[PDB]
Amino acid sequence: TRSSRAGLQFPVGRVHRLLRKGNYAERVGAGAPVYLAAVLEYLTAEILELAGNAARDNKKTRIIPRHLQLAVRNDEELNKLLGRVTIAQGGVLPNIQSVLLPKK
Amino acid sequence: KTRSSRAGLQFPVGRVHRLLRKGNYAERVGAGAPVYLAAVLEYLTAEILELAGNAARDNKKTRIIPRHLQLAVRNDEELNKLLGRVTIAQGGVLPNIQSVLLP
Amino acid sequence: PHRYRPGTVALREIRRYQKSTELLIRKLPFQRLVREIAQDFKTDLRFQSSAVMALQEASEAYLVALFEDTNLCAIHAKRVTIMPKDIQLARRIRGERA
Amino acid sequence: TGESKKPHRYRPGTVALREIRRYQKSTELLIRKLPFQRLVREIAQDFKTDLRFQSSAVMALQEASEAYLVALFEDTNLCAIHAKRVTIMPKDIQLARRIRGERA
Amino acid sequence: KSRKESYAIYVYKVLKQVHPDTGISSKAMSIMNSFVNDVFERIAGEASRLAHYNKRSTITSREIQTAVRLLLPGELAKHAVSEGTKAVTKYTSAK
Amino acid sequence: SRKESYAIYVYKVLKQVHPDTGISSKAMSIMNSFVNDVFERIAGEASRLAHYNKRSTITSREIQTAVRLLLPGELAKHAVSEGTKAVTKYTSAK
Amino acid sequence: DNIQGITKPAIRRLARRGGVKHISGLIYEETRGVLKVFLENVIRDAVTYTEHAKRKTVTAMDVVYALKRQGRTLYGFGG
Amino acid sequence: DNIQGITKPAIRRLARRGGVKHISGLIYEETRGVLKVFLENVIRDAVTYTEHAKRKTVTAMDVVYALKRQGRTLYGFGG
DNA sequence: ATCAATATCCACCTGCAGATTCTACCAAAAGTGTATTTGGAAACTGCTCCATCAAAAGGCATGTTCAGCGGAATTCCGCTGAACATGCCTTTTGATGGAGCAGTTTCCAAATACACTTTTGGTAGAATCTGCAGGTGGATATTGAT
DNA sequence: ATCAATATCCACCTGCAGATTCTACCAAAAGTGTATTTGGAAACTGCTCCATCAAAAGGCATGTTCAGCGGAATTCCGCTGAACATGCCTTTTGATGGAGCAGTTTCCAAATACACTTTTGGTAGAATCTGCAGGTGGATATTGAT
């Protein structure tokens, strides 16, 4: 498989197919699906890594939506890339404006 | 006999058809698409020119300049919304001063 | 009797809801609202249950975030109580009142 | 000597209002041309060396930059007024960019 | 010099139809040219997606129509749709 | 009938970074939307890039500039790093 | 009216998650009006995709596409 | 240090066009900082298009496409 | 500072909804091998417009003085939201026909596709044209002191 | 109210940059006419899964009461707007060398186009498995009165 030659877990052939059927251009080079597949895989690895940690920090072994939200909002770069995206069932980061805290 | 003629339009059906193909928006483009699309574009152009021409008339001018285009679009609820994220160069803004600021 | 002071329970609620992810509006009432509005666009419609859920997830995230900006606007005016004028300012600056 | 009548002096706010009316009526660029050009050149240069600019490219940047700042002052102005002030401060600009999604 | 086209002569024609004695500056015309191109892109883009979402390889007038409805606000959409439908119907009546 | 998704591939990557961690259905669905969303964003910018330059072909060079345009700093750096690595490895192979 | 089904307690909960400590009584009706505009906009678009596909059932994808158009991308129900 | 060419009077004028009657002394430096970020983001993208095309000259179109990417569509310079 | 009414937390336990391993299945991919075609790079270079220097002049920026008035701190009242507990009506949950989403197959109107005949939107450019920018002087406010 | 210091409206005037221009070349586009391929509307249909109805869970509607927040009123000082003098540097108008953008013909590495064979990802009814939600007990932190 093309993914094997590229050393990827993501489906190079599928990515190629989706690029063609997406009407992005008249033609698609051979390397584009490989490059794109690799990027998709890396971004996936990046989020699963942070979400997994989020799960471990909650004494849990299965990643749920809340963990993906925590991973993204707590990371400057991912939060920006996903700045106009809503993660269903992710809730929000704990945060209370200081002025609303009880006057010590 | 041009397709624009056959459809009763001033905007170019032929060009629009061509532009729809090179834009690679779909595998194929049916014959009524360019006609309909040229029609819409012509209507929106007529709508903004009508209002800009009026704005030029109100400023005692004969030549529409960018400021008139901006006055026409910002004073019209729908054109304002359609072009809500758009910047018209040399258009300035609408006169508007918040009340508390007046003496 | 025991009686917590004003703000203590509210602060407690903020900590509780910022901790969970569950939807905060009840299903049926919301579902009824969606169908009512939809009826004005096309009659005799049906909805996949996942469609109503998508709409609820989207609407709540939207209100919660607007609430966040609304809070910032009240605090900007040196208040700690949100009011209609705060929601309005947040919406206008967001371009929703463009 | 006849001096019982002081030199004419507009009150604070009168000329500022005269200014808002004048600038809202015209459409010319308000930032000096050459200085704005040097800024574009400086910033571009720190990104990539030996760049040239069509002059219409510099002008496009200036029309975009001024419409962006003019509109930001509008929101800033509504933020000051919201605080029951009539003087814009750094905190108003900041609140406006924050709600706009430009910083949080 | 590979000819670069614009909608300028068509904008001009339409201008003469609504304001016979009114002209337009080259800057104003340049803005009108960006306006037409921008709406062309938005509508075509929306039609493109619409076709894809439904597993269709052809963009027909029906796609432009839904696209116009998703894109333009209220009254503009109604009038646009009307002129669009009108032109297609007339286009079909001929030949 | 069928219905494709990136689920099995997301899972494979999941085991590479956290062999002991599982992922729920809803969470996997979020991951699927994420991959699809980024694919569309990148392909979309690559498409425009080629159209702007009167080119009829989307190559890895268009994907790379699109990535630079769409991802924030470091994310962009590593993504470019990974992309170039996969093309190199792909070419140097029968 | 159904909009009143969106109760004071439910609106209060949304505010709490949004970090709000004190809420003015006029906030409830104001919030309902905003939720109504929000839903009208999204539902209008979703139904438009529904009609275009010639269906009588609003699908999750119709909502996801509407949300995307309004710049409110939602992950979890498809695309 | 060209950011100082954006003078106090130029900034005041821009504020007036924006309907501002009173300006605090700290606004000038804050505005220069905001303009600098705005320009960096736009120029950054504009120069990326220039390089993708293998040119050494930033064109008006490069800026127009950069502006469009950032949701700041500009009319009057080619689209 | 001293209880005391409650909220919060941690360790442990377990049923079960949702996750997982399984043998099976096949249309749809995805990969391989071959022949045809073509996008766009390399090399040459016509010609655009970008960087730069020159010189004069004024409209704008800089820097200061000065004091009106707006921002901010303090005080304090009374209007209103937060806490609460009494009481039940709407929402949630689980079960069942039927609407319509979706899979399969027929086939006609409609869209590619290659060939040429013809019309036309750019444009180089020439010429003559013409709306209005910008200087002006005078009639009408608009301000602010008293 | 009355009036002096300025700012503002403004129609008339007219040369000049920007617009409307037209003789004419034309490569490119857009249109006409078969010939060939095919997307997707239709009609029939099986079965998910959606709307509906009965029933059991449990959150919301209510009125009372007062803590504490919003904002009116007063006050003080420091900052920011108005006016002014000085002269710098932006703007304007040309000229010019040449960087580099953009047109053109050449030509092949790479991509589309089927044809053919192996493989895999999705679906599924079946069986087994398991992370953790949620309920219990008991410790101890938090809050609010005294």
CSV table of N, CA and C in Angstrom, one decimal, chain C residues 52-90:
chain,number,residue,atom,x,y,z
C,52,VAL,N,-31.7,17.2,16.4
C,52,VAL,CA,-32.2,18.0,17.5
C,52,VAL,C,-31.0,18.1,18.5
C,53,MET,N,-30.3,17.0,18.7
C,53,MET,CA,-29.2,17.0,19.6
C,53,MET,C,-28.1,17.9,19.1
C,54,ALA,N,-27.7,17.9,17.9
C,54,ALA,CA,-26.7,18.7,17.3
C,54,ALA,C,-27.2,20.2,17.5
C,55,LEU,N,-28.4,20.5,17.3
C,55,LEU,CA,-28.9,21.9,17.5
C,55,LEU,C,-28.8,22.3,19.0
C,56,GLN,N,-29.0,21.3,19.9
C,56,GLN,CA,-29.0,21.7,21.3
C,56,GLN,C,-27.5,21.9,21.7
C,57,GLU,N,-26.6,21.0,21.3
C,57,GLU,CA,-25.2,21.2,21.6
C,57,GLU,C,-24.7,22.5,21.1
C,58,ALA,N,-25.1,22.8,19.9
C,58,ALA,CA,-24.6,24.1,19.3
C,58,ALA,C,-25.2,25.3,20.0
C,59,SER,N,-26.5,25.3,20.2
C,59,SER,CA,-27.2,26.4,21.0
C,59,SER,C,-26.6,26.7,22.4
C,60,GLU,N,-26.4,25.6,23.1
C,60,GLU,CA,-25.9,25.8,24.5
C,60,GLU,C,-24.4,26.4,24.5
C,61,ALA,N,-23.6,25.8,23.6
C,61,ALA,CA,-22.2,26.3,23.6
C,61,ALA,C,-22.3,27.8,23.2
C,62,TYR,N,-23.2,28.1,22.3
C,62,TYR,CA,-23.3,29.5,21.9
C,62,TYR,C,-23.8,30.4,23.1
C,63,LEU,N,-24.8,30.0,23.8
C,63,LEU,CA,-25.2,30.8,24.9
C,63,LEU,C,-24.2,30.9,26.0
C,64,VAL,N,-23.5,29.8,26.3
C,64,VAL,CA,-22.5,29.8,27.4
C,64,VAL,C,-21.4,30.8,27.0
C,65,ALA,N,-21.0,30.8,25.8
C,65,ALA,CA,-19.9,31.7,25.4
C,65,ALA,C,-20.3,33.2,25.4
C,66,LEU,N,-21.6,33.4,25.0
C,66,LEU,CA,-22.1,34.7,24.9
C,66,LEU,C,-22.2,35.2,26.4
C,67,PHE,N,-22.5,34.3,27.3
C,67,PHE,CA,-22.6,34.6,28.7
C,67,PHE,C,-21.2,35.0,29.2
C,68,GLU,N,-20.2,34.3,28.8
C,68,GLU,CA,-18.8,34.7,29.2
C,68,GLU,C,-18.5,36.1,28.8
C,69,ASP,N,-18.8,36.5,27.5
C,69,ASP,CA,-18.5,37.9,27.0
C,69,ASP,C,-19.4,38.9,27.7
C,70,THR,N,-20.7,38.4,28.1
C,70,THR,CA,-21.6,39.3,28.7
C,70,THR,C,-21.0,39.6,30.1
C,71,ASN,N,-20.4,38.6,30.8
C,71,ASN,CA,-19.9,38.8,32.1
C,71,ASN,C,-18.7,39.8,32.0
C,72,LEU,N,-17.9,39.7,31.0
C,72,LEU,CA,-16.8,40.6,30.8
C,72,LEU,C,-17.3,42.1,30.7
C,73,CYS,N,-18.4,42.3,30.0
C,73,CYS,CA,-18.9,43.6,29.7
C,73,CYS,C,-19.5,44.2,31.0
C,74,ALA,N,-20.1,43.3,31.8
C,74,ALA,CA,-20.7,43.9,33.1
C,74,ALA,C,-19.5,44.3,34.0
C,75,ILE,N,-18.5,43.4,34.1
C,75,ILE,CA,-17.3,43.7,34.9
C,75,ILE,C,-16.6,45.0,34.4
C,76,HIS,N,-16.6,45.2,33.1
C,76,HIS,CA,-15.9,46.3,32.5
C,76,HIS,C,-16.6,47.6,33.1
C,77,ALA,N,-17.9,47.6,33.3
C,77,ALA,CA,-18.7,48.7,33.8
C,77,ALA,C,-18.6,48.7,35.3
C,78,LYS,N,-17.7,47.9,35.9
C,78,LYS,CA,-17.5,47.8,37.3
C,78,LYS,C,-18.7,47.2,38.0
C,79,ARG,N,-19.4,46.3,37.4
C,79,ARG,CA,-20.5,45.6,38.0
C,79,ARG,C,-20.2,44.2,38.1
C,80,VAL,N,-21.0,43.4,38.8
C,80,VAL,CA,-20.8,42.0,38.9
C,80,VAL,C,-22.1,41.3,38.6
C,81,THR,N,-23.0,42.1,38.1
C,81,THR,CA,-24.3,41.6,37.7
C,81,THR,C,-24.6,41.9,36.3
C,82,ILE,N,-24.8,40.8,35.5
C,82,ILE,CA,-25.1,41.0,34.0
C,82,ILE,C,-26.5,41.5,33.8
C,83,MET,N,-26.6,42.4,32.8
C,83,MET,CA,-27.9,43.0,32.4
C,83,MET,C,-28.1,43.0,30.9
C,84,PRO,N,-29.3,43.3,30.5
C,84,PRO,CA,-29.6,43.3,29.0
C,84,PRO,C,-28.6,44.1,28.2
C,85,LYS,N,-28.2,45.3,28.8
C,85,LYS,CA,-27.3,46.1,28.1
C,85,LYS,C,-25.9,45.4,27.9
C,86,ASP,N,-25.6,44.5,28.8
C,86,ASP,CA,-24.3,43.8,28.6
C,86,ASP,C,-24.3,42.8,27.5
C,87,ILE,N,-25.4,42.1,27.3
C,87,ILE,CA,-25.6,41.1,26.3
C,87,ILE,C,-25.6,41.8,24.9
C,88,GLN,N,-26.3,43.0,24.9
C,88,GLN,CA,-26.4,43.8,23.7
C,88,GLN,C,-25.0,44.3,23.3
C,89,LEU,N,-24.2,44.8,24.2
C,89,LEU,CA,-22.9,45.3,23.8
C,89,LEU,C,-22.1,44.1,23.3
C,90,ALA,N,-22.1,43.0,24.0
C,90,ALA,CA,-21.4,41.8,23.5
C,90,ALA,C,-21.8,41.4,22.1
